[PDB]
Design an enzyme around this catalytic site. Structure first.
Site, PDB file in Angstrom:
ATOM      1  N   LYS A 122      10.425   8.360   3.788  1.00 46.99           N
ATOM      2  CA  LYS A 122      10.047   7.537   2.645  1.00 46.99           C
ATOM      3  C   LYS A 122       9.312   6.272   3.064  1.00 46.99           C
ATOM      4  O   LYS A 122       8.472   5.772   2.310  1.00 46.99           O
ATOM      5  CB  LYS A 122      11.287   7.190   1.823  1.00 46.99           C
ATOM      6  N   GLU A 206      14.495  -1.409  -1.117  1.00 49.48           N
ATOM      7  CA  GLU A 206      13.475  -1.901  -2.031  1.00 49.48           C
ATOM      8  C   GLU A 206      14.145  -2.409  -3.299  1.00 49.48           C
ATOM      9  O   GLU A 206      15.312  -2.113  -3.571  1.00 49.48           O
ATOM     10  CB  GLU A 206      12.446  -0.814  -2.360  1.00 49.48           C
ATOM     11  N   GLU A 281       5.864  10.604  -8.800  1.00 43.57           N
ATOM     12  CA  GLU A 281       6.826  10.027  -9.730  1.00 43.57           C
ATOM     13  C   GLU A 281       6.697   8.511  -9.759  1.00 43.57           C
ATOM     14  O   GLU A 281       6.570   7.865  -8.714  1.00 43.57           O
ATOM     15  CB  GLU A 281       8.255  10.430  -9.357  1.00 43.57           C
ATOM     16  N   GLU A 294       8.463   8.391  -4.373  1.00 45.50           N
ATOM     17  CA  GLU A 294       8.472   9.729  -3.790  1.00 45.50           C
ATOM     18  C   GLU A 294       7.244  10.541  -4.194  1.00 45.50           C
ATOM     19  O   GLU A 294       6.543  10.202  -5.153  1.00 45.50           O
ATOM     20  CB  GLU A 294       9.753  10.476  -4.182  1.00 45.50           C
TER      21      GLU A 294
END
EC number: 6.4.1.3
Lengths: 673, 247, 261
Positions: A122, A206, A281, A294
């Site tokens: 990620k 985050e 998304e 993602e």
């Protein structure tokens, strides 16, 4: 659907279930030989029979059959397969699977391997998205290793914290934090859970986004680098990090933001040389600051919801891309076709933990295909069994209409007219979502199911008019059963003297309250008086078909009669919720007051997990009795299912043992005091 | 409730391997009208299932083996429980439907000292005396004596059907190999050949002992049709005051 | 010169000797008679009329069609006779031929005797001595068992049926004696059990010999299956004749009346 194009004569569809059937059907539209792999247990599934020949690939467990690559290339050698499709998840993220397919003639129908690697981690995904000029969730770029680093990152980003490990199908491994002490203890537990699940420990911290909308953008990409965005798919309704209802044309989203979304997604795809169908998304807020969350290289689970509005077969074009052909359809070709709404009917019990895993066999399974504007995608049939070795998915139901109201009404009618028996489904949850006022008007968020039902799902609360309608229908059905009981053939020795009772005086016990009902018959019309209110129930009164459509006061109601007993008990599914009623004649109800009540007490269960393994089944519910020898559930640990004796009295507060979950030793199957 | 209703849920209710069990009551519910079935002695000798149901509106008496409890093996209690029910359904012109999934009689010393022979004879007599229409369906294994104890065609049975998973045999296939090829001591291929040639209804079928190998999903429909044509059945037996059942 | 004559005579002489003289010697060794001498002792002298002496098994599987496995009569002696002048139909099972195991021809002969008896209205006496069911024969053995049981049930209450177990009996063959009116046994040589002791070992692991599981004492003192037990073959046969003198020949005939003093 031009049959002149010769993409691949023989194809191997490396997945099972509804998507396997969908892919096989799509290949049938091309006249393409289908090779569908199946486990030995699943040799009787729909896709294995419908496909042109098949090869068994191992035992019931997916680890030893679908993940045991030996059987897969043996099947490929047997069938001389040329194309492979990972399907929903499965081996899409397996780069070893990709390279071993590349070593063979089979070609991985999908994007580049390095793209899958980039989406796997990620941190690199966010870095690339920022490089791809895509708005990002605010936070810190890098990997945290210590609690002090985590709390400092919380300082820069703020108290709302997404401690998120890399990878995870359907956004696995996300957590919530609100305090510095919360930051550090959550970081410790997140490192623990990342080591347990994946072991990457790449916790991408985050800033959390409150009241968000998880909005998907689908990008179809040819092997030539062209990217084409196809509308969107709003997925704001979810629980347990899983989507249940999908709205393809987002009500919150407008045209200009939608086209900006698609342009950014196309730029991101071109920055990676995307050559497949992918999903991006976003976390749309009140200000439409859609942030990249993602990117799934696999085909989306709920792709049909937009396939209706886009009017294009995504699998067909994906196969053409696998051939290498350019994108024949342009952005102008992408035109929205009305409104489309999809709901995934699962084999889970919604009354417990917003969907609790269940096992069993399907006795009756009938779809609402006769309804207009309703389509069903499923990979199960009457008699198919839910296996713990695989996910518990029944089917997906899609409706299209002119506007949102038409699609919602068609979903409501389709869900009422959908017959499932043998296992417990979540139709009540889906219907309550699609008829909830907040979901109707549009003000929905990712926490929709956590605040609408703070205490958990409790079923539809029928109103006074609805209560009278349900009581009238139940009384009419009971009287109809009696009347049919009074109908024999002609004996010719002892004639039957039909009794001439005019008005039936019944007592109905719905929930706790007791209602007196006076029901009279005339032809096929029932005049029912409930506590003064007079209603008319008219229907064909066919007491054998699972679905019965009555017309109470002109309004048409579709009900199901699940069970009935000579003692009077009836189970009626009415507007999605199953109510248990107890109908008695006035004399019988009057005499029942002399019956002594039989009471059974069972509360306060307690035990942790003292052996590891996959739980066969769950045997307790919060508020059950235990003693020296009472088993909470059945746990199998290396070919032995020991009875796990409680031996003490405590208090359950919630249950973590669910059939099909590999819960280890000391993992607290049920949490207690 | 249509008479020719298909029952696809019964297509894969019989597990492939012979060491797995299933609930015969699910089959009964699928077949009978409106899935309604009044059970008799539902808690006593649970390895046999007896009760009343309706087929196309006509009362029928359902008897069957339960492969869950005691693997469906017949014993004394199940023998008496089924025998009296069959005799009652006989006395009042109620047709009988049998579901056969019996591996054999239950072995043991208590069974022998209790007189398992007498009670097995009770059940055999109850089925062999029946002059009402009898329809028999063989879902799975039917070996040993029990195969003809459970209303075989040879007991003046009317119509006998077999699912594609039936296994009609003299006795245990491995036991048959060990008792035939004892002087061969090369059962490595002998067992495979014997199970290929005799673990199927094909011996009985080619011998005509079963009328057809019906698909599981046609069961209800087939039975309904039969229950019509046999509703007029009449058979004549020698005169007697009464018979001597092994009571 | 036609070979039919000496063929018939050779077949006759082979049938009357069962399946070999050495096996008959072995049968006498365990203190047991052959089927034919049992019938001779049971019936009045010079009154046995035998049927189907040459009937042979039609099985052709597992090499059973070879001449070494062909025995006329095929492990059963069937016919009619007279006890004290009253008619009776009698079948006896021969342990020499394939251990007396029941095949298609065996059951067909028994069925024909039973059918003729029920036609005329005379009792049936069966001397059961058989290892079990012929597995070489196949499903035909099960068919024969079921045919015999059907005729037993049909004839119950019509004609008297008497079964004397004169040797081991196992498998489904135990159900013919249970469906008959009376069931006598011979001590120390007769056995009635569904499954042998080895199966009991394989299932529940209990040490029981053949005598404890299915002996005459077990079935006459703690089982209720058998009615009486006699010392040996000769005593059993004499007592059986004495017992038969009591019974009426058929349900239609009244109870017998004799000379009284």
């Amino acid at each position: 659907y031009d049959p002149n194009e010769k993409t691949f004569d023989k194809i191997l569809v490396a997945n099972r279930g509804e998507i396997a059937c969908r892919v096989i059907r799509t290949c049938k539209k091309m006249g393409i030989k289908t090779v569908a792999i199946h486990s030995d247990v699943d040799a009787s599934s729909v896709h294995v029979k419908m496909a042109d020949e098949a090869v068994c690939v191992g035992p019931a467990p997916t680890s030893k059959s679908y993940l045991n690559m030996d059987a897969i290339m043996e099947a490929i050698k047997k069938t001389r397969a040329q194309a492979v499709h990972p399907g929903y998840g499965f081996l899409s993220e397996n780069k070893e699977f990709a390279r071993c397919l590349a070593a063979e003639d089979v070609v991985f129908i999908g994007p580049d391997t390095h793209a899958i690697q980039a989406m796997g981690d990620k941190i690199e995904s966010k870095l690339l998205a920022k490089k791809a000029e895509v708005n990002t969730i605010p936070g810190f770029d890098g990997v945290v290793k210590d609690a002090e680093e985590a709390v400092r990152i919380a300082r820069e980003i703020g108290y709302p914290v997404m401690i998120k490990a890399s990878a995870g199908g359907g956004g696995k491994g996300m957590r919530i934090a609100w305090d510095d002490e919360e930051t550090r203890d959550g970081f410790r537990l997140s490192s623990q859970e990342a080591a347990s699940s994946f072991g990457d420990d790449r916790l991408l911290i985050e800033k959390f986004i409150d009241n968000p909308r998880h909005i998907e953008i689908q990008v179809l990409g040819d092997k030539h680098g062209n990217a084409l965005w196809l509308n969107e798919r709003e997925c704001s309704i979810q629980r347990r990090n899983q989507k249940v209802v999908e709205e393809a044309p987002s009500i919150f989203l407008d045209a200009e933001t939608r086209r900006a979304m698609g342009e950014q997604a196309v730029a991101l795809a071109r920055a990676v040389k995307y050559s497949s169908a992918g999903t991006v998304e976003f976390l749309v807020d009140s200000k439409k600051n859609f942030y990249f969350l993602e990117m799934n290289t696999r085909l989306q689970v709920e792709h049909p919801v937009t396939e209706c509005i886009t009017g294009l077969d995504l699998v067909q074009e994906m196969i053409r891309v696998a051939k290498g052909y350019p994108l024949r359809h342009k952005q102008a070709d992408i035109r929205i076709n009305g409104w489309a709404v999809e709901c995934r009917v699962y084999a889970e019990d919604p009354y417990k933990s917003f969907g609790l895993p269940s096992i069993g066999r399907l006795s009756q399974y009938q779809e609402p295909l006769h309804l207009p504007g309703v389509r069903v995608d499923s990979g199960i049939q009457p008699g198919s069994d839910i296996s713990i070795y695989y996910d518990p998915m029944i089917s997906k139901l899609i409706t299209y209409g002119s506007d949102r109201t038409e699609a919602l009404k068609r979903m409501a009618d389709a869900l009422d007219n959908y017959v499932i028996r043998g296992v417990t489904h979540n139709i009540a949850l889906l219907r309550e979502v699609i008829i909830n006022s907040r979901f109707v008007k549009g003000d929905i968020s990712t926490k929709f199911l956590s605040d609408v039902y703070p205490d958990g799902f409790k079923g539809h609360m029928l109103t006074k008019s609805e209560k009278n309608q349900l009581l009238a229908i139940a009384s009419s059905l009971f009287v109809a059963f009696q009347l049919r009981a009074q109908h024999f053939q002609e004996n010719s020795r002892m004639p039957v003297i039909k009794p001439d009772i005019a008005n039936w005086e019944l007592s109905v016990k719905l929930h706790d309250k007791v209602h007196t009902v006076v029901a009279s018959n005339n032809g096929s019309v029932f005049s029912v008086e409930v506590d003064g209110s007079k209603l008319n129930v008219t229907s064909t009164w066919n007491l054998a078909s699972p679905l019965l459509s009555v017309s109470v006061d002109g309004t048409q109601r579709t009900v199901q009669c699940l069970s009935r007993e000579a003692g009077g008990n009836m189970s009626i599914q009415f507007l999605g919720t199953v109510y248990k009623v107890n109908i008695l004649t006035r004399l019988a109800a009057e005499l029942n007051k002399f019956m002594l009540e039989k009471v059974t007490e069972d509360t306060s269960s307690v035990l942790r997990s003292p052996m590891p393994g996959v739980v066969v089944a769950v045997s307790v519910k919060p508020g059950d009795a235990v003693a020296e020898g009472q088993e909470i559930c059945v746990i199998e640990a290396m070919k032995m299912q020991n009875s796990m004796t409680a031996g003490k009295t405590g208090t359950v507060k919630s249950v973590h043992c669910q059939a099909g979950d590999t819960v280890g030793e000391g993992d607290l199957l049920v949490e207690l005091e | 409730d249509p008479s020719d209703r298909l029952v696809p849920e019964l297509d894969t209710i019989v597990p492939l391997e012979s060491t797995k069990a299933y609930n015969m009551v699910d089959i009964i519910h699928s077949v009978v009208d409106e899935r309604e079935f009044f059970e008799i002695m539902p808690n006593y000798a649970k390895n046999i299932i007896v009760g009343f149901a309706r087929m196309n509106g006509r009362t029928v008496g359902i008897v069957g083996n339960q492969p869950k409890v005691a693997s469906g093996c017949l014993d004394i209690n199940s023998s008496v429980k089924g025998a009296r029910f069959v005799r009652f359904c006989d006395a009042f012109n109620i047709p009988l439907i049998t579901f056969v999934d019996v591996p054999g009689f239950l072995p043991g010393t208590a069974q022998e000292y209790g007189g398992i022979i007498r009670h097995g004879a009770k059940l055999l007599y109850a089925f062999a005396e029946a002059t009402v229409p009898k329809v028999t369906v063989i879902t799975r294994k039917a070996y040993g004596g029990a195969y003809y104890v459970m209303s075989s065609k040879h007991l003046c049975g009317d119509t006998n059907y077999a699912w594609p998973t039936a296994e009609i045999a003299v006795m245990g296939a491995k036991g048959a190999v060990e008792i035939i090829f004892k002087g061969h001591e090369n059962v490595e291929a002998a067992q495979a050949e014997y199970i290929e040639k005799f673990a199927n209804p094909f011996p009985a079928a080619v011998r005509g002992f079963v009328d057809d190998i019906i698909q599981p999903s046609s069961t209800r429909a087939r039975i309904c049709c039969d229950l019509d044509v046999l509703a007029s059945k009449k058979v004549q037996r020698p005169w007697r005051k009464h018979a001597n059942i092994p009571l | 010169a036609t070979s039919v004559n000496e063929r018939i005579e050779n077949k006759r002489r082979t049938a009357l000797l069962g399946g070999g003289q050495r096996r008959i010697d072995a049968q006498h060794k365990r203190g047991k008679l052959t089927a034919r001498e049992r019938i001779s002792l049971l019936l009045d002298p010079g009154s046995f009329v035998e049927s189907d002496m040459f009937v042979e098994h039609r099985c052709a599987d597992f090499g059973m069609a070879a001449d070494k496995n062909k025995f006329p009569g095929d492990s059963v002696v069937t016919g009619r006779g007279r006890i004290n002048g009253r008619l009776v139909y009698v079948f006896s099972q021969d342990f020499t031929v394939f251990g007396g195991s029941l095949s298609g021809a065996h059951a067909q002969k028994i069925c024909k005797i039973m059918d003729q008896a029920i036609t005329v209205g005379a009792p049936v006496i069966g001397l059961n001595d058989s290892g079990g069911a012929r597995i070489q024969e196949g499903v035909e053995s099960l068919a024969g068992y079921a045919d015999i049981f059907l005729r037993n049930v049909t004839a119950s209450g019509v004609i008297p049926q008497i079964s004397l177990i004169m040797g081991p009996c196992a498998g489904g063959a135990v159900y013919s004696p249970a469906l008959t009116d009376f069931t006598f046994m011979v001590k120390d040589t007769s056995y009635l059990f569904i499954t042998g002791p080895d199966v009991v070992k394989s299932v529940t692991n209990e040490d029981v010999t053949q005598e404890e599981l299915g002996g005459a004492k077990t079935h006459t003192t703690m089982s209720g299956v058998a009615h009486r037990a006699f010392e040996n073959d000769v005593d059993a046969l004499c007592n059986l004749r004495d017992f038969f003198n009591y019974l009426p020949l058929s349900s239609q005939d009244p109870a017998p009346v004799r000379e009284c003093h």
